[PDB]
Nucleic acid binder design. Structure first.
Length: 91
DNA sequence: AATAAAAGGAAGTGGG
DNA sequence: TCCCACTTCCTTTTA
């Protein structure tokens, strides 16, 4: 199955949920979720995965934080903002 | 208080 | 066996 970081990168490239997520600085790989519309994006992630429970933004961000150690996605010190690694952006 | 973002330990689930 | 890549649950902290 698709990995969470790839699902988010794919959405940013397609623009299909432009009111839920957007690039802040695409050259740096920084992106930001919508305060009011992030839950719809989280719901889509859970459905794509076929998870038993409804996915929430809180649970999706819990998964996002696990990428901090390996580097694929890191939290930025700005509201609802994260950053992909150069490796993820290049791949 | 009400609301929200951010955090992570711990245990459960999937598919190797 | 036992790690993958999350998911689920619960609690805490800060603004």
């Amino acid at each position: 199955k698709i990995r969470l970081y790839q699902f988010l990168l794919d959405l940013l490239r397609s623009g299909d949920m432009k009111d839920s997520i957007w690039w802040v600085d695409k050259d740096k790989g920084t992106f930001q979720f919508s305060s009011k519309h992030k839950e719809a994006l989280a719901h889509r992630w859970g459905i794509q995965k076929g998870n038993r429970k409804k996915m929430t933004y809180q649970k999706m961000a819990r998964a996002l934080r696990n990428y901090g150690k390996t580097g694929e996605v890191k939290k930025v010190k700005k509201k609802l903002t994260y950053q992909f690694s150069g490796e993820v952006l290049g791949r």
